[PDB]
Design a binder for this molecule. Structure first.
Ligand SMILES: *[C@@H]1O[C@H](CO)[C@@H](O[C@@H]2O[C@H](CO)[C@@H](O[C@@H]3O[C@H](CO)[C@@H](O)[C@H](O)[C@@H]3O)[C@H](O)[C@H]2NC(C)=O)[C@H](O)[C@H]1NC(C)=O
Ligand SMILES: *[C@@H]1O[C@H](CO)[C@@H](O[C@@H]2O[C@H](CO)[C@@H](O[C@@H]3O[C@H](CO)[C@@H](O)[C@H](O)[C@@H]3O)[C@H](O)[C@H]2NC(C)=O)[C@H](O)[C@H]1NC(C)=O
Ligand SMILES: *[C@@H]1O[C@H](CO)[C@@H](O[C@@H]2O[C@H](CO)[C@@H](O)[C@H](O)[C@H]2NC(C)=O)[C@H](O)[C@H]1NC(C)=O
Ligand SMILES: *[C@@H]1O[C@H](CO)[C@@H](O[C@@H]2O[C@H](CO)[C@@H](O)[C@H](O)[C@H]2NC(C)=O)[C@H](O)[C@H]1NC(C)=O
Ligand SMILES: *[C@@H]1O[C@H](CO)[C@@H](O)[C@H](O)[C@H]1NC(C)=O
Ligand SMILES: *[C@@H]1O[C@H](CO)[C@@H](O)[C@H](O)[C@H]1NC(C)=O
Ligand SMILES: *[C@@H]1O[C@H](CO)[C@@H](O)[C@H](O)[C@H]1NC(C)=O
Ligand SMILES: *[C@@H]1O[C@H](CO)[C@@H](O)[C@H](O)[C@H]1NC(C)=O
Ligand SMILES: [Zn+2]
Lengths: 9, 910
């Protein structure tokens, strides 16, 4: 992964 | 202890009984993607260990319509009878199957059930998802996502990881779809009305949360690994082009993992599928791994070098999970880190081995620094820690389970050496294959690892070993490592190692490191307690690169330094999970050294020094002018990681100042960065050229220059944007520069409107990601609100992006208040969209509050959290946020004048 974050910059 | 229609619920614990053991599920699922619902049925082969009147298992939001018990060993239940009585107790997400006659120990039975529900409309369970074609069409798929506790939303089962079972899955479907699941299709049979039925090979023993199945019309590209696994990458049909890199990386990485672990991937195929509405970044369902498009798909025209890095990481992470997670699963969520801390670490080992050009080894210290932020505040948690509710279990998925687990693994690999460490890994994975481990099982295998196989003769392991002093040494060193590592997993926090040098008398003290709580503070000693670590120190000196090692097992200790040299640098390369503070003139020796010949310290020693100096400032062990003094050397620094570490602190202060209206300091920081660092910034092309680091140095520095409104920079991007928009996309912006160009472009209503239009047409999710960042850099409140409002709708901007979007808006001055207001005035609504629970809510909360640094804001946020409590809305992230805001406040009143002064002084000389 939920560590998709890499959310944005 | 009882629901729903009256009648006592036979069982009280949220943990299931252990009496009935599942062995095998026949699972049939019949979804309709027109009526957005499904019908299903299952048969569960159970073994009954102790006599019972009832069967307890999980089920949530499922309408169970038929239930029967059968047995071939117990003639009372001989085909076909008998009906089970079904009792549902939603608060434990349990149901009770009531049996007519007490079941017999050691007899197998078959539990059969029919059930149905609508496809979920929210990211979990068996749920509906949509995507857009190049033609502008809208298609539907149905996909599963079960981890941690949502399998029970798709079919009734024993939804806890210890209950591994074989799964035999069947799916009925229309001819315009395919169906995918964990295992290869065995057979498709034509049904009367023209529907098809896919039968899948029975799975090996596995946990319920990994069961997966999908109905869609995706395209694939395929390849075989060395070991003959069919690897397929699926994506919506117009995007098949974008799956090439993933196919290449997953083959290369799966091969490496088979060599490294010395264990074959057991299944005959591996599918990676890019899902359009996907809440997590990725999910490691055994044989059918789901990704966000941004996690899997890569496109040379609009995906950047750092996009590539990320896609490679995520694939590395998920493939690592096929062993750490799938083959070997943690016993219960309190040791989720056995899965995640390990996958996280294997990223580093595997990407480093298969794609060294990606430089992932130089990025890794960031994994550890991000945790230390959390770990140096009281509200942190031990790596392994109890958890019970679905929300509690979700909370375990955090920087402590991932980054810290990885960081302490790295620390131990450094201690034991690669060979002994991989050997430990192999025997752990082999010994627990197809079942479960808990924290101690892992430390036993790692502390008992045999070099040079076994070992051999009469080596320590195994056959018939020779009783040697060496053998005794082995046995006790093993037990040492076991004791050491368990305290790294059961103690919260990170230790500070304080080092005083007396000619050749290095004295050592260890201490819980504490952020914003000064060396002598009322509550400082109360937080010190019996925090004691076994810490495997390392150091080198100014007169010797030799790495000396020694394990600090106690609160204090001394070591002796031949040659009585200038400086001593502890924690070489920062492989240890601890901060080092030097007393006396230690910090001045090291800073002197850096300004005069920085190369005499190792590149990673430089990264860790820069890191530690600024942490210690916050710890009140140093003053801010010492740390700022160090950043002076960065003018000569060509090792990108240390350069970027240093810059990021300067950049961070600027935003901090700019967030408030401390404009005289923010302006001086602006002038100090553009001027000191002018050489580097001016050296940068607006292209995609050079190595990976070059490419990332560029987007980093040019973003920075454009953020500080550096005129030539802003000019160049403005030009590029104009050419692009005027050429109607027919010109190419180099990818490394894309996000910067778009955001400069977004500073006008015309550019902004144009970007938003491109957003709805684009076929690169990576590109969409950069656009949505750009739109979020808008100075107009009307725009930022529109973004937010669009994201609420989930139509134009999908709801898997709402959390990231609020985060992006909130961290810019023009956006912080708006975002904070939005979250408080729409909390009830945000919760209908997400679990409490979800990474999304945790990001939304921290993303809109953690940057606050005034007593005013502290108040509001304390009031908002107190309010979310009642209802029973509790998250650990509440405390974490409050301590973070408090940290920031204490930091400003402690160091702000020092910062103001240091910058004014720098203006003068020289
Ligand atoms: C449920 O999953 C387990 C795996 O977790 C399956 O166990 C595997 O069963 C196969 C077939 O019985 C075994 O393979 C056989 O092994 C012998 C010697 O290794 C070989 O001569 C045979 O030709 C065949 O390859 C395999 O060893 C075994 N693995 C384990 C770890 O037990 C089990 O069959 C599954 N049950 C169902 C009902 O599908
Ligand atoms: C990332 O990958 C590199 C190689 O691609 C890893 O380093 C290489 O392999 C070993 C590390 O295990 C290095 O040392 C070697 O082992 C013995 C005993 O330590 C030593 O005496 C030998 O002379 C040999 O050097 C090896 O030098 C190194 N090779 C290169 C070219 O750097 C590296 O460890 C990986 N990083 C991580 C974090 O896994
Ligand atoms: C989902 O339900 C739809 C009902 O709308 C099914 O489609 C109909 O199937 C019958 C029988 O083949 C046809 O005579 C109709 O023409 C179909 N309707 C349409 C609009 O095409 C469909 O078969 C179901 N799908 C599954 C997988 O169960
Ligand atoms: C210290 O940095 C300096 C450059 O500022 C270097 O010092 C010497 O470099 C010359 C050639 O460039 C070598 O012949 C000398 O051996 C170097 N000095 C020493 C003491 O070795 C050098 O790169 C850095 N120091 C070291 C030890 O390499
Ligand atoms: C069954 O009886 C009790 C209840 O679980 C337990 O203590 C015992 O060990 C069990 N024995 C067997 C053979 O299942
Ligand atoms: C159970 O399913 C069968 C169809 O296989 C149906 O005929 C029967 O009526 C169902 N029983 C109940 C109680 O729903
Ligand atoms: C720190 O955390 C502990 C929980 O481990 C708690 O008992 C203690 O009261 C906290 N102290 C402060 C000052 O926050
Ligand atoms: C201070 O900053 C806020 C936004 O952060 C802005 O609305 C306000 O006008 C600023 N005031 C001054 C005097 O700069
Ligand atoms: Zn993971």
């Amino acid at each position: 992964x939920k560590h998709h974050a890499f959310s944005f910059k | 202890p009882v629901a729903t229609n009256g009648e006592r619920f036979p069982w009280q614990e949220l943990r299931l009984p252990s009496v009935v053991i599942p062995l095998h599920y026949d699972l049939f699922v019949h979804p309709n993607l027109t009526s957005l619902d499904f019908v299903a049925s299952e048969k569960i082969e159970v073994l009954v260990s102790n006599a019972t009147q009832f069967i307890i298992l999980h089920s949530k939001d499922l309408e169970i319509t038929n239930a029967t018990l059968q047995s071939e060993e117990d003639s009372r239940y001989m085909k076909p009878g008998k009906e089970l009585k079904v009792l549902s107790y939603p608060a434990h997400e349990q149901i009770a199957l009531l049996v007519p006659e007490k079941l017999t120990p050691h007899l197998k039975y078959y539990v059969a059930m029919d059930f149905q529900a609508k496809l979920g409309d929210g990211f979990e369970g068996f749920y509906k998802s949509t995507y857009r074609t190049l033609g502008g069409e809208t298609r539907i798929l149905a996909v599963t996502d079960f981890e941690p506790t949502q399998a029970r939303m798709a079919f009734p089962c024993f939804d806890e990881p210890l209950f591994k079972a074989n799964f035999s899955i069947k799916i009925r479907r229309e001819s315009r779809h395919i169906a995918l699941s964990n295992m290869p299709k065995v057979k498709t049979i034509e049904l009367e009305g023209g529907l098809l039925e896919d039968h899948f090979e029975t799975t090996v023993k596995m946990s319920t949360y990994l069961v997966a199945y999908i109905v869609c019309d995706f395209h694939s590209l395929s390849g075989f690994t060395s070991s003959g696994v069919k690897v397929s990458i699926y994506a919506s049909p117009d995007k098949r082009n974008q799956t090439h890199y993933a196919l290449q990386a997953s083959l290369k990485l799966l091969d490496f993992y088979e060599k490294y672990f010395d264990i074959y991937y057991p299944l005959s195929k591996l599918d990676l599928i890019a899902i359009p509405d996907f809440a997590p970044g990725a999910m490691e369902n055994w044989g059918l791994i789901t990704y966000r498009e941004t996690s899997l798909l890569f496109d040379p025209k609009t995906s950047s070098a750092s996009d590539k890095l990320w896609v490679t990481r995520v694939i590395a992470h998920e493939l690592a999970h096929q062993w750490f997670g799938n083959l070997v699963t943690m016993e219960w969520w309190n040791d989720i880190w056995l899965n995640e801390g390990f996958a996280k670490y294997m990223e580093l080992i595997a990407v480093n081995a298969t794609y060294p050009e990606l430089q992932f080894d130089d990025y890794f210290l960031n994994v550890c620094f991000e945790v230390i932020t959390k770990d140096s505040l009281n509200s942190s948690r031990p790596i392994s820690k109890p958890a019970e509710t679905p929300t509690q279990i979700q909370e375990m998925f955090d920087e402590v389970s991932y980054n810290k687990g990885a960081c302490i693994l790295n620390m131990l690999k450094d201690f034991l050496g690669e060979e002994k460490f991989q050997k430990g890994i192999i025997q752990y994975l082999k010994k627990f294959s197809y079942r479960n481990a808990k924290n101690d099982d892992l430390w036993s295998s790692l502390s008992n690892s045999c070099l040079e196989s076994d070992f051999t003769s009469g080596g320590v392991c195994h056959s018939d070993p020779k009783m040697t002093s060496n053998m005794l040494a082995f046995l006790g060193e093993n037990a040492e490592v076991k004791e050491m590592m368990t305290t790294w997993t059961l103690q919260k926090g990170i230790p500070l190692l304080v080092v005083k040098q007396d000619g050749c008398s290095l004295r050592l003290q260890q201490e819980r490191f504490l952020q914003g709580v000064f060396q002598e503070d009322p509550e400082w000693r109360a937080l010190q307690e019996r925090y004691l670590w076994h810490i495997p120190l390392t150091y080198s000196t100014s007169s010797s690169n030799v790495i000396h090692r020694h394990i600090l097992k106690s609160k204090t200790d001394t070591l002796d330094l031949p040659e009585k040299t200038s400086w001593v640098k502890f924690n070489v390369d920062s492989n240890g999970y601890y901060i080092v503070h030097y007393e006396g003139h230690g910090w001045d020796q090291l800073i002197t050294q850096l300004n005069q010949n920085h190369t005499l310290l190792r590149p990673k020693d430089r990264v860790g020094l820069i890191h530690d100096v600024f942490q210690l400032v916050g710890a009140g062990r140093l003053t801010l002018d010492k740390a700022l003094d160090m950043t002076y050397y960065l003018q000569h620094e060509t090792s990108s990681p240390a350069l970027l570490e240093g810059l990021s602190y300067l950049e961070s202060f600027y935003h901090m100042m700019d967030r408030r209206n401390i404009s005289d300091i923010s302006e001086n920081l602006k002038r100090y960065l553009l001027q000191y660092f002018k050489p580097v910034i001016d050296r940068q092309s607006w292209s995609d050229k050079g190595s990976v680091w070059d490419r990332m140095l560029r987007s980093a520095l040019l973003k920075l220059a454009c953020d500080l409104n550096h005129a030539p920079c802003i000019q160049k991007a403005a030009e590029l944007f104009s050419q692009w928009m005027e050429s109607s996309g027919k010109l190419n912006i180099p990818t490394d520069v894309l996000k910067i160009v778009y955001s400069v472009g977004a500073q006008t209503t015309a550019g902004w409107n144009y970007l938003l239009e491109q957003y709805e047409l684009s076929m690169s999710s990576a590109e969409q990601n950069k656009i949505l960042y750009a739109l979020s850099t808008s100075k107009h409140q009307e725009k930022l609100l529109k973004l937010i409002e669009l994201g609420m709708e989930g139509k134009v901007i999908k709801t898997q992006n709402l959390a990231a979007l609020l985060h992006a808006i909130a961290r810019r001055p023009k956006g912080q208040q708006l975002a904070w207001d939005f979250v408080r005035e729409n909390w009830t609504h945000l919760l209908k969209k997400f679990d409490l629970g979800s990474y999304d809510i945790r990001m939304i909360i921290s993303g809109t509050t953690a940057h606050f640094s005034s007593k005013d804001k502290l108040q509001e946020v304390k009031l908002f959290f107190e309010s979310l409590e009642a209802q029973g809305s509790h998250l650990d992230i509440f405390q974490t946020v409050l301590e973070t805001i408090t940290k920031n406040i204490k930091w400003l009143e402690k160091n702000l004048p020092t910062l103001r002064t240091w910058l004014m002084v720098n203006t003068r000389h020289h």
